[PDB]
Design a protein around this nucleic acid. Structure first.
Ligand SMILES: [Mg+2]
Ligand SMILES: [Mg+2]
Lengths: 305, 317, 306, 318
RNA sequence: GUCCGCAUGCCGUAUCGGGCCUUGGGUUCUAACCUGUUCUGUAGGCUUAUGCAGCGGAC
RNA sequence: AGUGAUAAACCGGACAGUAUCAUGGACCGGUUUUCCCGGUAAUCCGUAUUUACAAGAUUGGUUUCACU
DNA sequence: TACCACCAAGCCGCCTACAGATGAGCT
DNA sequence: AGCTCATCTGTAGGCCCGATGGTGGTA
DNA sequence: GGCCATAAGTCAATCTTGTATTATCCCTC
DNA sequence: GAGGGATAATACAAGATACTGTTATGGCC
């Protein structure tokens, strides 16, 4: 088994093979479809038919080659970049260059032996992309709302026109998301179970499903809550902001309007916890119950809480 | 002469009068048209005819009251908020650094006697409003344009549609600005003089007018350079202390923002610009340091030309 | 007919800025020397300046001679805390810092703020403080070498031991020098005896307190003295003499632990639910206030009042 | 066959964690005493642990005796830079319970990395470094008092003058004690003579350099000794976009880095080979202190070079 | 009711330190070239939230 | 200490933002310092958007409960 | 009358000015 | 043998630990 | 079956990669 | 003569004040 490290850039790839005997092989490639073919050819050139490849999450510049090597039939791992930086410091490295990083990643692979990566389902990729687009347009719509507060009279026609455009466009995406989840019989069913939870509506169901996916990729619900950066360490905040920000207003709706939510708020209030500390706790709980309900395959039963 | 201070908020006003004798008269008001009428009456109630009012520039909530008192005929000073905080710290070592109350503003007014404020011409306000809007739409366009780079294919129809809208809207505002400056013969002429400067185009001239204004508010061109936050901040003391000169940045950000690309166009493509670039480069100045220097020069020539009242002359450089 | 004068000070040079009643400025630079200081007094009297308020920032000890020179000439002198000067320059909206700008900034500070006048301290006050701060300097150095013995290699120990002996001997020499100083003067002898009467204050703390309070009662209220040490909260401000605050911590600790009036104070705050160091912080402030109080009363400490 | 052991050391206690080949752990705490260390060795020999690789943090003087003990017992001992330990913890997960490193973590550090073996210094190497470090302490105290002389009150001056005389005498005594140490050892005498042959390196710097280089040549290349002193430039590059500015890394012994500044200033100013080097970089757009930083690195590298070569400084090579 | 006097209550997390560890990247390849801003120090200044409560005195 | 179970309990302060304010040090002519008066589109002192923007990554600690 | 162990727990200042080191060539 | 002068904006990471003074109690 | 008001409000995740602005010159229909 | 593309610059640090929106549910028409 060889151990390969790839540093990624927009234009180039730096590759570092670490052979069983211990010697290295290094080569640069263009980060293109042609270059990716040159890479696989080069590996099979040196009779490397079994290898574990390690690569940092670097924008979306690492995604094409990761899929290419997965299809060629290698074990690919796409590591969190923060681990890589810490590992470099554990190795005592005194420089940051592309060839240094590529070699560092081969060692990371060998020593740590990280979990294998799997390309998401096309529908999961599509759903995620729409949910991310929807958040962007909501942010822009909120920016333009803030402006109406202090807008001059001459500025106001321009702002009103943009708000109309943004509202139509948000409405269009919400339909595109609905059509996506309705077509797939799995997603249609899984979304309806999420919405059974009091506090989770149309919007929050789409975001949860976009990050949970189709299959059960988490073994336990507490892992999903960790993935969202909601577990304490203060909250770690080591997880997707898009997922975490989506849960805040549902947390308020639950703690206030819903029966099971109030119960949680009251118990924590009795122990002496402040407003946002309870909301923090409820965010984590919603995440954890969301993954719970899906595993069960059964509508939200309030009796358990 | 009385010295009044007004601490402003969205909803409420807080007023503190300082009498010549030294006694105070304080009263809170609503921040409404009705509220502002009570204030003027309450001052004229206590036979306060001549006063110097000092308000701090918190935003658009304090503009109506400032205009109200200016019309009532009092002297109004609208002060930079950072001066207020600094003044409080000059008044003692153990002062609260999260408040400047109406009393503090009355003392500020007495000690410093700040320069009088003047309500901008309706035409100047309109121009500044459109220019500020244009910059906001430019920023939103840049955001969406950055997103095209890495966008997923399902996202691209949405982003493309938004870019078309934003481009059309930007083009509408540009025409709306042009129509404003053309309809006033003072602005039409002043804008033509600015655009005679190599490196100043349609977009930059509109910014420069919005801040320079109709009248000549500044006595000297160097003051306008300071106003934009472009002059180098010297830091020297005795023999030991020798800090490095840097751009002060203590000035209007929207001006400072507008001049960086003009500066880069001047030093690269124009004769008078390259001349300046070469001299500083010889003297050992780095690339972006020369841009900073050219930004200040453009500001200072912009004001100079308008004073001179004649097109840009290269012979002066 | 009062002029306003600002002086920015350096090791070598002075930068003077006279602001006249009519509102115009006169400026000149002088050497920071005895000869230079005489030229300044002459230059002022050559412009017919008899009355003037002079403002100068505390800048090491490089401004102490000129401040004394002008005070003798009959001018009003203010020595301002330089943190105030900086804030004022910001309030004035200045965009540069030079020796010429600062001299002009200080003349305006003088005109606008009209700060309190400065009084040159008594030679005895000036000597007592000199000895006390030197004593702390040696204590800090002794503590350094004492830390070193913990982890010292064997070959280093003869050197460290030798230094500890020398420092201990020197510390006794100063303690005697301080005792001799506050025995010759009848006023200091009485006042030092009054301070020691407080349970929690001994030989060392008494001399520190006497150095900062001084001979004459230059504070109006007790909390003013507590603020001068930086003990009043705002969480403690720290905006005061660190050498004075330093000196009260261990006195505070022995007071709350092994005195009647201290334990009484500790218990009161313990009942209301305060942490250990919060009570010490509180006792430091209280010790400062009582110390000042006892002196103004002029009678030994009485526990009844607390 | 090989076990991996981590030890977490405090002043009073030792926490030990043995990682067995199979994967199970053994844990037992000990006193940080001579009795404790003998108990530890017996406990390992109890469980038939003959070959092991122990990993300890370099926290100071409290961990040195147990390291000595285990080295003599015949185990492989590694004494790691604590900053590596903290970084290793963060490489194991994103949301660890604590940032603290424990004996278990150290045993895992040992397994994954197999760090280089530690070697107990020679008594004379230990003596020399101790004296040199004492000399730097007294120099700093002497500097303090010199600064005070400037702005002292006249009543304070008798005390400051007295202390200065004492410190001057003690520095002089301790310099002679260093000279007597190196003169008595024929190896150290020769190596010190070689270092002084370099223009820019005198008595004070040669002693510092020996204290960190030592009797035997531990570094494979001279550039590694420059890295050891923290004198090499740290590059920061990625892709087209990311491009930081190279600065002195400073990841290394401050004592070395402190010692070489004035030699570098003497070399670039007064010596033939150092003026040559100054002039070349000054021909490029390099500032004074930038050139000084470069010369500091060069002196470290040449110092180690000359010792390895075993022959006095040859100017021809520069 | 008002104005002063407080060694009063409420508010208060001091300050100085010490020791130890550190085996670059690229190149024309290791005492060469490109890439390099040391280690620390010193002195001085600091006048209430009397804000609110108590308590005492005067009118 | 390891393994399994967990929609329970203890630990938990989310994101995104918006608007607005800013009159150099000095130099060149008079006076013969500055100030003041007159002049400054020149020279020396300058690392923009006082947080420029975009994208991607993130599989808890512990307590109960079983088994070794 | 002189000597000794103990209290608290490691969690945060703002400014205005200053200075030293070592080694090689020159007196 | 003693003296002078060469450098000026600021910015590595971690882990282990100790002393101060004054008083009541003890010898 | 459709529309509005309300709940919280002091302060602090880590990294790996990218790109825009305006105005004048220059080349192409 | 109008329309569109290419181009210049790169280590980062260092002022204040006033404010607002998100979603999902149980209430109301
Ligand atoms: Mg990378
Ligand atoms: Mg000064």
């Amino acid at each position: 088994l060889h151990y390969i490290g790839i540093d990624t850039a927009k234009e180039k790839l730096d590759v570092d093979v670490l052979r069983p005997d211990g010697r290295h092989r290094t080569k640069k490639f263009a980060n293109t479809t042609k270059g990716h073919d040159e890479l696989v050819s080069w590996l099979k050139g040196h009779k490397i038919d079994h290898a574990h490849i390690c690569i940092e999450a670097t924008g979306t510049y690492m995604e094409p080659v990761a899929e290419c090597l997965y299809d060629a039939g290698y074990i690919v791992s796409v590591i969190n970049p923060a681990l890589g930086k810490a590992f470099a410091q554990s190795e005592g490295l005194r420089n940051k260059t592309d060839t240094v990083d590529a070699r560092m990643l081969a060692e990371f692979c060998r020593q740590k032996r990280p979990a294998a990566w799997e390309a998401p389902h096309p529908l999961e990729r599509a759903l995620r992309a729409l949910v991310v687009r929807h958040q962007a347009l909501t942010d822009m719509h909120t920016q333009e709302l803030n402006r109406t507060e202090t807008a001059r009279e001459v500025q106001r026609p321009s702002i009103d026109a943009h708000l109309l455009w943004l509202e139509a466009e948000l409405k269009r995406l919400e339909k595109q998301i609905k059509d996506l989840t309705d077509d797939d019989p799995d997603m249609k069913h899984r979304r309806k179970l999420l919405e059974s939870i009091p506090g989770i509506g149309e919007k929050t169901s789409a975001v949860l499903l976009a990050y949970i996916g189709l299959k059960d990729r988490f073994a336990h619900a507490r892992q999903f809550a960790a993935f969202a950066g909601l577990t304490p360490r203060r909250m770690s905040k080591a997880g997707h902001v898009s997922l975490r920000r989506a849960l805040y207003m549902p947390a308020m709706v639950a703690t206030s309007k819903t029966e099971w939510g109030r119960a949680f708020r009251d118990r924590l209030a009795a122990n002496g916890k402040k407003g946002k500390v309870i909301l923090g706790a409820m965010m984590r709980k919603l995440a954890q119950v969301a993954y719970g309900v899906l595993k069960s395959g059964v509508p939200f039963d309030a009796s358990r809480h």
